[PDB]
Amino acid sequence: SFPWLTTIVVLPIFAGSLIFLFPHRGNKVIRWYTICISMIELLLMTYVFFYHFQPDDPLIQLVEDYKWINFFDFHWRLGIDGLSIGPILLTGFITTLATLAAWPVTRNSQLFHFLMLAMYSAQIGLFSSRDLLLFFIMWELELIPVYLLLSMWGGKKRLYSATKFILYTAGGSIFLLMGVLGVGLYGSNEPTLNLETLVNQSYPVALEIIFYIGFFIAFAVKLPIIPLHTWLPDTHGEAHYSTCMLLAGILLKMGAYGLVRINMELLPHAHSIFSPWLMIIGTMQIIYAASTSPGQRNLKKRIAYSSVSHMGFIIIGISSITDTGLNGAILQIISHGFIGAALFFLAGTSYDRIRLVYLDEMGGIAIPMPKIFTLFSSFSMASLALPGMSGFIAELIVFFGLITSQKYLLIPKLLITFGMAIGMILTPIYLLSMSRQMFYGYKLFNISNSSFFDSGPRELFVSTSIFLPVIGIGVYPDLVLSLSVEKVEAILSNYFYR
Amino acid sequence: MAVLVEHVEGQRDLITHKSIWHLSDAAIKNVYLFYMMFTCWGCCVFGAAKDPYYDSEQYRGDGGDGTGHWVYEKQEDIEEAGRAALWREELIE
Amino acid sequence: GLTDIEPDLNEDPRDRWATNGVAPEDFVYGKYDEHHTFYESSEKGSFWGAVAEEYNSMDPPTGFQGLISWLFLPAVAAGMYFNVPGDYLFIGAGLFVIIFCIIEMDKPDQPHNFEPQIYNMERGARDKLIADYNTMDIWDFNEKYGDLWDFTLK
Amino acid sequence: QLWLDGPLPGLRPAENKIGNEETGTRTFLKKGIYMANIGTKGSALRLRKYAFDLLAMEDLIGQDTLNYVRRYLRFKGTFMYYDFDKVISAAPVADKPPLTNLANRLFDNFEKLQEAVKLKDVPLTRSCYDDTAVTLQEVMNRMA
Amino acid sequence: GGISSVCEPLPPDRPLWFPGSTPPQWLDGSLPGDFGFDPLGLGSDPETLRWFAQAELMHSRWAMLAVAGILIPEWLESIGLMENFNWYDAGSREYFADPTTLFVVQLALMGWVEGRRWADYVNPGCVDIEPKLPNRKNPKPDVGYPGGLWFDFMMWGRGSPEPVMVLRTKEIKNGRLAMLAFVGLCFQAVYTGEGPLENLSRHVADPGHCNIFSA
Amino acid sequence: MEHIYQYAWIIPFLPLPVPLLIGAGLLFFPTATKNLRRIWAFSSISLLSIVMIFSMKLAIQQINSNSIYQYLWSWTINNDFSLEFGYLMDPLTSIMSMLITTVAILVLIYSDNYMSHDQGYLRFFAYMSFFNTSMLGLVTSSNLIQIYIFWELVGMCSYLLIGFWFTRPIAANACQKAFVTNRVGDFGLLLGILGLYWITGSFEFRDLFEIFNNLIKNNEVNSLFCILCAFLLFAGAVAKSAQFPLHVWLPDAMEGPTPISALIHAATMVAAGIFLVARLLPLFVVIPYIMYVISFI
Ligand code: CLA
Ligand code: CLA
Ligand code: CLA
């Protein structure tokens, strides 16, 4: 009866709108108020997941429907299931930790924390939206906060990166809007935008293919798909590391979530048509990004291309029409949200001390900064698909989903299985080299770098608190999969003969 | 009960013990809940803690502000300030 | 880093993939690598003394804040073990978060909390600024040192 | 050919009349499960092994873990259903009626166990699983 | 500054067995586990004090080995990795030889080394077992605390991690505890008619009963 | 009889608390942890001694018996997939566990005095104990997934220990070279495991061997795929045992400290390839050309 999801969506942006009533200077009160709001919201989502979400239910849960515009038949409609609660919890966790890690920011702290809370609200509103136009609105609601965060707290090339990001996202999202208009106006009697009634809609093959292309262009601009990935390297490389958490851990997974929710669920026939061509694209994306990563002298650009490489396993699990492949895609979503954010955070904190960019001049950092060396090595191992971490089990489950797939027969099933395997040969080749060019060797450092130079309690806590779920999922993957084994099956139930 | 013995000719016999065990969804929710409260506690405690580098003079004295581009802007600013100081010195003299 | 003088440009190229440390022929083995640089000493301090020193160096919360920050996690673990209702746990966690954040807002401000322009003024003027900001109300401070935050004025 | 064009094939009907009389198929069957093609000997070995795996499910039966009981039951039930179909289809004609009767009793026990799990009734689940247990022990004794 | 390999005597205000009392004049804290406990004055003579210190050390080590060899196999039997262990009945079991000939062989073998130890106590340094390598210098060991390659292959003594006095008092205290433990086990095996861990189990449950006063 | 095997999960997981506590301390309480240097080493030695005593009792039981004991549990329960984890105690496992424990306790005792004046003492012993845990998990593994998990974990420990002195540039190159050379073998081993799962449908050794023998003897599978999977499986053994053509990592693996050279590249890690080939020998026997390839290599 109580509007839980509406309260969860509204609370961060509504609380951040009141951050301008504070007449205090500095950043202390602003950052403590922002972390209070973030932790209260996190506890609210924890209560919702604990007491009102049932992982055994394949249906929509905690639905809320309020008619907002009559002409479009447009409703503020919210609802969660096994697909959305994982991204919602990840969004809350990563956004709270990014607010905590953005504490040295003393320039325009009020606007920074307001934009962080706005990003919180927009991501949560996207992940819990059951209306197509509401989905599009929540998709669009992050162009301005990320643009401002990039252009006001980014790197050397922040302005060009922000312009490229906003223009690329608008270019994808106009195709998203065209797909929304096409799907929502297909009704013979009246327009409809609810996903529940749209999941039973029947389209001709050509119109379904056109709608799939219209949605897929947007979901390939957002989730990096070759060759619509060029915004990502300069956007993530020249962004603040706290913003890089949201960019590489949350915003990248939104394209995959839209692919499951819309392309995979609403339009199954066009998805079955397009998936074998998506498999080759994902494998070539893995190889292409894992080969582009050694060519990048910049550390953050290398990490961004690593993120592009890791998105290929999600693409494969999407295109492999099995329950196991979709479960592996969700597991890789969670694993990458836990790995890329921490890697970007460590890179930013290390740059705040070393103040160097290109890898060929950052030797010997392990001598003054051993703890950040340890965390960087551990998160590289997590990136390396090492067992005991979530990445290995995610890639293994994706491999199993391909092997167990019934759509493909033998030879492609070989040539793709070999394919990503080449990727996990290329993934060490730069990553360890990165460490070898960033921590190994001897350099004579200043005496002032002997003390008060390593990561403090806050950075250690952030890295540990993102590292622990990685180990917890790599040991017991069903800490995540059990939330979405049922709903994924329902998503697969439309892909078989009926 | 949950124990199977297989005999193979020319091979040592095998005794297999099996236990199909899985965590309940309540236990998983408890793990998630405890990790959320641990995250909140750590955020509070380690935000209340002192930061050895970001509160130091080595960071704030150089012009740091938590912003990722302060180094390049500070460099261009000190070159422009040197040129302006030369202009001031030539104006005074 | 930052250079007040334009640095000499690199005339000779360097390999990108090479290790950035010193040359192996210039490496002082046993010293540069900490392999023969730990000689023991009878003067080793207490283990628990080291634990207390490391904990106190982090500047822990003290008093009621220290009490709640110490007693939060064992209370949550005991409540989850004793099968007490979880709504009470959520109420306690929210109350702890709000109380902790309010107490932290009540704590005085330090020089590192402000802008680099405020940090890099005259040290005596900065000390007077910090002393006033923690003493008078925020409205009096804003009506007295407001123009110091117009960074285009100077 | 590289990939299938239409929708993926569903539950292939058994040709040994081991399904339900009214429907022609069993409720615990799950579509999309990859069954490896080994042959009659491999199907018999997998049948015995998976009967042992389902007899390893005493621990999973509880008030909190009935969904995992249902999931494991559906998975292994599809596996042993199609393995039983394979071994009956390649059995001698004299041995087909008893094998079909044993399979029918085992799958009726599977349906009763799934029905008990659905109502979240634990004593009913235990009794139905005990009947399933004696049937599975009979299955491994037959197929050793 | 470095590693001191000499025992440091305890200060005269060290904790005592009976606080508020005057420690005896022959117990100045130079021995391990020195708590000033000598009501009968048995350590008045320094030579007999040295002999009694060596005897206490020997009894300590034998008692610790004894209690370990009682408890760990008993803890394994209760777990289930030992079929029929019983330390009381262990002496009357059937082995490859009679107890008498085994006792004679043990007497000869042990009276070799106990007698080499006697010669070392009477004449320190008369018997040396640590090798005299060409340029390695062998430090002079204390009587009753030998050990180079064989007895101290860890180099945990001679001032390494804990000072020699600290580790020696630790050894002596664990030894006294083990002597008391072994005498308790010997009396319990004939009083309760049961094993040690079983007696502990029936004492932990309802400790008001199942005691010395209920057999 | 059956009691000892039940409590054998303790064999890989007994050294683990020392690396866990050392890592947590050295990341959070460095001075307090470093105050207990030789104490940590002796704790590792005592835990490995307990593991060695258990393994000796297991070996003595295995010599005078005609039974192999396997324990399994359901790691993952999904609608489409299900994974298992457990331990198998066959004579090869007992032999390997005896070899590992007996060499490793002496290596720990040696490392106490080898790194007497080093500052990375605690990190060194944490790395060694974590390798011991990984290798003991590898030799007692019951399915191919667990084998691959502890295979890659052992490779990770070797990478960490070879480049122990990270300030040395030669070790800096050598650790990465060793990890990549072993990762080629890991890629081959994973491909072989996936192919074996596709052909058979199982990861357990006995069931996979019986299924493969039935398939080969009745000509129900093409021989080229079987030979390819066997060669891919043997590639991992070639890489980890440092054989042709993936032998290049072994000479550079000696840029690490000598006890690591002994324990890792002399007795245990280089024996992982031999252990894997001997474990998969009933599979390789029926496959036509793979035994000649193994002998030629
Ligand atoms: C050294 C420590 C020690 C310990 C922990 C135990 C432990 C146990 N004894 Mg044993 N016992 C000991 C020495 C010890 N004993 C000695 C020295 C003797 C006689 C010379 C006995 C003779 C004995 C008898 C006759 C009986 C037990 C029994 C028991 C139980 C206690 C109940 C009781 O009635 O006995 C108390 C008996 C005494 C004679 C007291 C002796 C205490 C000595 C002098 C000092 C120990 C104190 C010191 C503070 C120890 C530290 C405690 C802890 C930190 C280890 C318990 C399992 C009982 C049993 O299990 O019945 C079911 C029982 O019947 N014990
Ligand atoms: C094995 C025999 C043994 C021996 C030889 C010694 C010897 C010594 N003790 Mg140690 N001690 C022992 C066991 C022994 N102890 C035990 C079991 C305890 C715990 C109760 C202690 C606790 C202790 C303390 C607290 C202190 C010493 C100290 C001393 C030193 C001076 C006292 C003396 O002159 O001893 C001469 C001793 C003997 C010749 C033994 C005579 C015993 C008579 C003849 C009979 C035995 C009594 C009876 C059977 C006990 C049964 C057990 C009981 C629970 C019922 C000397 C090195 C002092 C020190 O400075 O440390 C170095 C001191 O402060 N001891
Ligand atoms: C119970 C504790 C104990 C303690 C604290 C001491 C303390 C002391 N002893 Mg004594 N000692 C003991 C029991 C003990 N001893 C026993 C039972 C004996 C008879 C065998 C001796 C006989 C003895 C000799 C002959 C020598 C010492 C020496 C020393 C010093 C070495 C440090 C030490 O031992 O490590 C402290 C830590 C431990 C005792 C931990 C317990 C060991 C566990 C239970 C087992 C060991 C693990 C594993 C099985 C061994 C490696 C396997 C390998 C063989 C393959 C120190 C002053 C040396 C000396 O004083 O020279 C200066 C000397 O060489 N001791």
Ligand SMILES: CC1=C[C@H](O)CC(C)(C)[C@H]1/C=C/C(C)=C/C=C/C(C)=C/C=C/C=C(C)/C=C/C=C(C)/C=C/C1=C(C)C[C@H](O)CC1(C)C
């Ligand atoms: C009073 C007084 C007085 C003065 O003034 C001072 C003083 C002297 C200090 C005081 C005190 C005293 C005392 C109390 C003492 C005590 C002692 C003891 C108890 C000992 C034991 C001691 C003890 C000991 C050695 C022990 C030993 C043992 C042994 C070998 C054993 C063996 C065995 C075993 C294992 C097991 C098996 O199955 C059997 C057998 C084979 C049998």
Ligand SMILES: CC1=C[C@H](O)CC(C)(C)[C@H]1/C=C/C(C)=C/C=C/C(C)=C/C=C/C=C(C)/C=C/C=C(C)/C=C/C1=C(C)C[C@H](O)CC1(C)C
């Ligand atoms: C009686 C009773 C009764 C009831 O019924 C129950 C109860 C209660 C349980 C009981 C009680 C008990 C007790 C208390 C006991 C105690 C014990 C001890 C102390 C032991 C030790 C014990 C101890 C021990 C073994 C020890 C040992 C040791 C050793 C070998 C050493 C070695 C070494 C050395 C020298 C040196 C080098 O460099 C090193 C090494 C090589 C390392």
Ligand SMILES: CC1=C(/C=C/C(C)=C/C=C/C(C)=C/C=C\C=C(C)\C=C\C=C(C)\C=C\C2=C(C)CCCC2(C)C)C(C)(C)CCC1
């Ligand atoms: C999905 C999700 C989640 C969940 C998660 C989980 C469920 C977790 C669990 C977890 C667990 C259940 C865990 C367990 C255990 C663990 C452990 C046991 C660990 C250990 C560790 C150590 C001891 C150390 C470590 C380290 C560090 C920290 C870093 C450096 C390196 C090293 C490795 C040293 C959350 C809520 C976040 C939110 C979002 C979504």
